[PDB]
Design a protein around this motif. Structure first.
Motif, PDB file in Angstrom:
ATOM      1  N   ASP A  14       0.831   7.840  -7.095  1.00 36.25           N
ATOM      2  CA  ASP A  14       0.245   9.150  -7.362  1.00 36.25           C
ATOM      3  C   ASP A  14       1.278  10.252  -7.238  1.00 36.25           C
ATOM      4  O   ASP A  14       1.387  11.108  -8.127  1.00 36.25           O
ATOM      5  CB  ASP A  14      -0.885   9.428  -6.378  1.00 36.25           C
ATOM      6  N   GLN A  24       0.819  -1.214   0.000  1.00 42.25           N
ATOM      7  CA  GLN A  24       0.000   0.000   0.000  1.00 42.25           C
ATOM      8  C   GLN A  24       0.852   1.263   0.000  1.00 42.25           C
ATOM      9  O   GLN A  24       0.464   2.265  -0.608  1.00 42.25           O
ATOM     10  CB  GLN A  24      -0.989   0.049   1.172  1.00 42.25           C
ATOM     11  N   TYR A  48      -3.708   6.729   6.193  1.00 43.68           N
ATOM     12  CA  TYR A  48      -3.620   5.300   6.508  1.00 43.68           C
ATOM     13  C   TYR A  48      -2.245   4.947   7.044  1.00 43.68           C
ATOM     14  O   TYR A  48      -2.116   4.276   8.076  1.00 43.68           O
ATOM     15  CB  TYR A  48      -3.850   4.400   5.292  1.00 43.68           C
ATOM     16  N   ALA A  49      -1.208   5.395   6.339  1.00 48.34           N
ATOM     17  CA  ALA A  49       0.166   5.201   6.760  1.00 48.34           C
ATOM     18  C   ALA A  49       0.452   5.930   8.053  1.00 48.34           C
ATOM     19  O   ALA A  49       1.278   5.477   8.831  1.00 48.34           O
ATOM     20  CB  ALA A  49       1.119   5.682   5.670  1.00 48.34           C
ATOM     21  N   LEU A  91      -1.262   3.768  10.819  1.00 51.49           N
ATOM     22  CA  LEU A  91      -0.505   2.531  10.952  1.00 51.49           C
ATOM     23  C   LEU A  91       0.902   2.804  11.461  1.00 51.49           C
ATOM     24  O   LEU A  91       1.468   2.000  12.209  1.00 51.49           O
ATOM     25  CB  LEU A  91      -0.485   1.816   9.609  1.00 51.49           C
ATOM     26  N   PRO A 113      -8.422  13.275  -7.427  1.00 46.35           N
ATOM     27  CA  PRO A 113      -8.275  11.882  -6.970  1.00 46.35           C
ATOM     28  C   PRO A 113      -6.886  11.547  -6.469  1.00 46.35           C
ATOM     29  O   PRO A 113      -6.763  10.977  -5.382  1.00 46.35           O
ATOM     30  CB  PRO A 113      -8.637  11.069  -8.217  1.00 46.35           C
ATOM     31  N   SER A 114      -5.838  11.918  -7.210  1.00 51.05           N
ATOM     32  CA  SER A 114      -4.484  11.564  -6.795  1.00 51.05           C
ATOM     33  C   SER A 114      -4.062  12.301  -5.528  1.00 51.05           C
ATOM     34  O   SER A 114      -3.441  11.698  -4.649  1.00 51.05           O
ATOM     35  CB  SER A 114      -3.493  11.840  -7.926  1.00 51.05           C
ATOM     36  N   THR A 153      -6.174  13.955 -10.564  1.00 48.32           N
ATOM     37  CA  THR A 153      -5.200  14.602  -9.691  1.00 48.32           C
ATOM     38  C   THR A 153      -5.778  14.959  -8.338  1.00 48.32           C
ATOM     39  O   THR A 153      -5.138  14.714  -7.313  1.00 48.32           O
ATOM     40  CB  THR A 153      -4.631  15.873 -10.334  1.00 48.32           C
ATOM     41  N   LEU A 201      -6.164  11.004  -2.558  1.00 52.87           N
ATOM     42  CA  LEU A 201      -5.580   9.736  -2.163  1.00 52.87           C
ATOM     43  C   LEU A 201      -4.239   9.938  -1.486  1.00 52.87           C
ATOM     44  O   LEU A 201      -3.866   9.146  -0.624  1.00 52.87           O
ATOM     45  CB  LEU A 201      -5.444   8.806  -3.361  1.00 52.87           C
ATOM     46  N   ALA A 202      -3.493  10.976  -1.876  1.00 52.77           N
ATOM     47  CA  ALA A 202      -2.287  11.331  -1.138  1.00 52.77           C
ATOM     48  C   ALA A 202      -2.619  11.651   0.310  1.00 52.77           C
ATOM     49  O   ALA A 202      -2.002  11.102   1.225  1.00 52.77           O
ATOM     50  CB  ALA A 202      -1.581  12.508  -1.805  1.00 52.77           C
ATOM     51  N   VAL A 214      -4.026   8.203   2.011  1.00 50.57           N
ATOM     52  CA  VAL A 214      -3.084   7.123   2.266  1.00 50.57           C
ATOM     53  C   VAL A 214      -1.940   7.609   3.149  1.00 50.57           C
ATOM     54  O   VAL A 214      -1.382   6.834   3.928  1.00 50.57           O
ATOM     55  CB  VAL A 214      -2.619   6.460   0.959  1.00 50.57           C
TER      56      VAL A 214
END
Lengths: 154, 85
Positions: free
Chosen positions: A149, A142, B77-78, B81, B66-67, B64, B70-71, B74
């Motif tokens: 991106d 992941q 998320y990272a 975590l 979207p990109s 973008t 998502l940056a 995530v």
């Protein structure tokens, strides 16, 4: 590092024991083992070794070994991970999914058998959960997919 | 609040409508309110017909947002975590 110093035999009529700055001797007896080193505290008394480092040299060795383990131009291997993330990862994703079926249908026997045998006694046999490592590999999946991106766009 | 309700829902798939039905629904048979709607709004007063123009989105550049969302997600998320304290 291990360094030594020889003693004579003429001066065994006299003593051998001024040992100024006492900390060094008590430090010498800790890095240490043997019966034969213990037999060679005669003829040998060691000497402390320490390390002074140039901050120029320390910082450029830090440059080397915290920067040059990243590779040249620094985009290159992370865009190569981006190359991995759409061509090679899906194969080890298939390996991950097959592991996370096959290991799982027998590690669901594990809390059952924890209820069966005892409250948590000694190690019965071979296998374990081991899923955490496979999940960390999925986390690599992941994070390098997040790299896609960032690198690919702009 | 019904006048601007028809003037809101006009822009949907009324791809062409004859004028006198809009006269029935809107109000006011041959008014200057037809000038108000056909000019303050679009719906070009052509021959017996309010005409529907076309507009698009293409979703082109984004790709973008979207990109970058998502940056954000995530990195989140990272980040969760990631935690350790």
């Amino acid at each position: 590092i291990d360094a030594f110093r020889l003693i004579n035999a003429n001066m065994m009529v006299l003593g051998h024991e001024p040992r100024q700055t006492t900390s060094n001797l008590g430090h010498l007896n800790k890095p240490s083992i043997q019966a034969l080193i213990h037999g060679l505290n005669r003829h040998y008394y060691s000497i402390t070794i320490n390390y002074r480092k140039n901050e120029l040299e320390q910082k450029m060795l830090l440059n080397l070994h915290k920067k040059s383990w990243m590779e040249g131009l620094t985009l290159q291997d992370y865009s190569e991970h981006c190359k991995h993330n759409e061509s090679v990862v899906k194969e080890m994703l298939e390996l991950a999914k097959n592991y996370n079926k096959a290991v799982e249908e027998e590690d669901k026997m594990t809390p059952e058998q924890l209820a069966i045998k005892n409250v948590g006694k000694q190690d019965p046999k071979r296998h374990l959960e081991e899923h955490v490592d496979v999940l960390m590999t999925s986390n690599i999946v992941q994070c390098l997919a997040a790299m896609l991106d960032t690198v690919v766009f702009k | 609040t019904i006048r601007d309700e028809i003037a809101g829902c006009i822009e949907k798939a009324y791809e062409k409508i004859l004028f006198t039905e809009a006269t029935r629904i809107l109000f006011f048979n041959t008014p200057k309110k037809m000038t108000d709607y056909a000019k303050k709004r679009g719906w070009v007063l052509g021959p017996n017909n309010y005409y529907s123009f076309a507009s698009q989105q293409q979703k082109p550049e984004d790709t973008t947002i979207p990109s970058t969302e998502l940056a954000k997600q995530v990195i989140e998320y990272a980040r969760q975590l990631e935690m350790i304290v």
